[PDB]
């Protein structure tokens, strides 16, 4: 035991649902509790083929009825969107919109994809814009259905300019029955995922319709979490092109995203992954003011989260804008470095939440592992811990991992138990992906209902 080393344990964070009560499992407690922000009715709109709408409505009237899972212990039941979320979602109320089949034959005829993708998106974007441009009956969220792959940033970026929430739906995910390979098996093989497939789309659709399924129930005041990620795009033929991103959450309401600038850095071939001091400090002042106005309170601590190490001069620019006691911590997470642990006795992998502290700055966090309540491990293989190291700034190490576990529960796209990485970075990946379709696209909305 003398040479034995200790893994500290972080208590599982929890989230509070409607009526003020608090629970740990997001989807399990939600049915018993209800969404944090109830939404009265949801009506959507669909663009695509006639068979798409028939497939779309065939899915909608299916998910309202209770749907179970093959392994109900691993994936709990979904009694229905009307009961779980306390809302009402019909099919005949849904706004129906059509695209002529010959239009698909009109522009899919060209086998070239580089010219087709940008222009085929224009047909998708323009008709939706003409729909909710003067109609009194405004549609909450538009469900785009795609027949075949034969696109995300290309479509979302223009739609982003008009503050319209949309959710893309590949035809396979709703018609995997008929969709079969040469062996007759489904392309996506949705035999077991059924019961959980409805869970993630319903949470997504409810979120896009203005609802907030849950929020962190164990958050101290005065702190804010900011995620910065680096993305390089090949759309620009010029080698000097590498974008960045920045996210805010406010930890109590809808998130906030500010690009600051597209930022054509040096980028000798594709990028360097380092904010220049001019842009870095400019975004931070433009970042804190969002928290200052949202909570009408002076911020105290900001946890800048990234996947890369910060240099020295960028922190000096960072540190020269925060007033008084505002201290910045550089919590850079990395997934590459492996320290795969094995349970000596027994067959299950290391349970999640355990951490290995190598010093006062760096630590190994098992955001993925074995969770007892679900009686299963979310990591199919032996879990890979994420290296968490405090790149800059002085802060308690143990406090950092405590909130990272909490931050991994705030993923509204899917209703998973926890994310492998904190959502302050996972959402940032979806942030920079969308906005890089066109360089001149600006005036970006803060809401996270769209953008994903």
């Amino acid at each position: 035991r003398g040479s034995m080393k200790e893994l500290i344990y972080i208590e599982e964070p929890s989230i509070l649902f409607a009526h003020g009560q608090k629970c740990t499992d997001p989807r399990d407690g939600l049915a018993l509790f209800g969404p944090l922000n109830q939404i009265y009715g949801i009506k959507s709109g669909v663009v695509g083929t006639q068979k798409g709408l028939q497939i779309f409505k065939s899915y909608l009237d299916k998910i309202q009825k209770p749907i179970y899972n093959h392994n109900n212990i691993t994936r709990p039941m979904f009694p229905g969107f009307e009961a779980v979320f306390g809302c009402k979602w019909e099919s005949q109320n849904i706004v129906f919109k059509e695209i002529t089949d010959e239009e698909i034959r009109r522009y899919l005829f060209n086998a070239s994809t580089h010219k087709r993708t940008y222009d085929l998106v224009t047909l998708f974007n323009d008709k939706i814009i003409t729909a909710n441009k003067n109609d009194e009956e405004r549609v909450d969220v538009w469900f785009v259905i795609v027949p075949e792959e034969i696109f995300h940033d290309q479509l979302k970026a223009r739609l982003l300019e008009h503050t319209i929430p949309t959710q893309i739906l590949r035809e396979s995910t709703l018609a995997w029955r008929d969709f079969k390979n040469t062996f007759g098996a489904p392309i996506r093989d949705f035999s077991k995922i059924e019961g959980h497939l409805a869970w993630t789309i319903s949470t997504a659709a409810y979120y896009k319709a203005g609802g907030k399924p849950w929020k962190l129930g164990d958050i101290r005041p005065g702190v804010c979490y900011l995620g910065l990620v680096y993305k390089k795009i090949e759309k620009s033929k010029n080698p000097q092109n590498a974008c960045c991103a920045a996210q805010m959450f406010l930890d109590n309401g809808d998130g906030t995203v500010f690009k600051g600038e597209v930022g054509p850095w040096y980028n000798p071939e594709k990028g360097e992954y380092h904010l220049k001091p001019k842009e870095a400090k400019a975004l931070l002042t433009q970042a804190l003011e969002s928290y200052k106005e949202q909570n009408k309170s002076y911020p105290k601590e900001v946890f800048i989260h990234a996947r890369t190490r910060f240099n020295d001069e960028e922190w000096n620019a960072f540190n020269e804008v925060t007033p008084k006691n505002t201290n910045l911590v550089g919590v850079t997470i990395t997934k590459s470095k492996p320290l795969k642990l094995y349970k000596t006795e027994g067959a299950f992998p290391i349970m999640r939440g355990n951490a290995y502290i190598v010093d006062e700055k760096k630590a190994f966090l098992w955001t993925l592992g074995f969770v007892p309540k679900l009686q299963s491990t979310l990591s199919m293989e032996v879990p890979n811990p994420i290296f968490i190291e405090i790149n800059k700034g002085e802060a308690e190490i143990q406090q950092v991992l405590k909130d990272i576990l909490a931050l991994t529960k705030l993923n509204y796209n899917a209703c998973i138990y926890a994310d492998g990485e904190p959502v302050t970075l996972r959402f940032a990946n979806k942030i920079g992906e969308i906005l890089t379709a066109s360089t001149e696209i600006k005036t970006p909305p803060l809401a996270f209902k769209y953008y994903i």
Partner: protein, 286 residues
Amino acid sequence: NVPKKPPDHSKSNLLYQQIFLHDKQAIEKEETYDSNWFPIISFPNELRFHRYDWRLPKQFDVRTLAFPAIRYKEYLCTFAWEYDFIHQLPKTETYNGQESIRISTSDILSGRYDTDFIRNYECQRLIVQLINKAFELRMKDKNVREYQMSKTFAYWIEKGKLEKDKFEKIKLVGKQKNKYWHFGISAAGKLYPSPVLMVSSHIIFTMDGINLIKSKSIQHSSRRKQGKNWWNDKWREKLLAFIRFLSDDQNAIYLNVGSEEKILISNKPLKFFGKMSYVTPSEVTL
């Protein structure tokens, strides 16, 4: 009858925590974990830079050296003696030992040592390079076949050489459908958290166990096939058995770098244990 009562969902919290959460939590008893980290129990007492001038050609391939050596500002990074490079290139006999600069391993590892012509971080990198390179020069003598991955150089055991195991019937080689699957490890070592050596687990596929499969799409696709049902014990044993097989002695692994001096890599992985953990033995089939 007539269920008229305030809801008080906080009561439902108690039922939720005692009906479907019966003895299902994270704080029950102690546990011990076997890591993927293999400590380096002994380092060679000396790290030397050699001053081979006009004795090795500038166009010579240093990777062809009998012992792991690295060129560095017309100096040779190796633990081996200055006279262990006779067969690879002659004319090296005109070299005096006192010309070479000798650097102790203890300070170069603890970070104490630092000079003008070399720094700690680059010194740590060179040691990382040397022990990483020493594996290639050792796997030839250990009777295993290699395989180049995207970055690493994985090694596996040829089919039928052993009795499909090393100890306790731990299957290290086998076949699925008409293809053969073979457990393989990787090499990696670094010194910052502690002097230790990393290994990684990959399964290498061959059409019969000898004639490899060049189509990387088949190799990757088959890789996910075999691991989809592997247990945690399966990954633990197939790695422990593989390392134990590669070790030539029950003590540790001898990484020959010098004529007689070498590097000792403990076959027992660095050990971890936690104070409180899970309890669940439930399993039926899949």
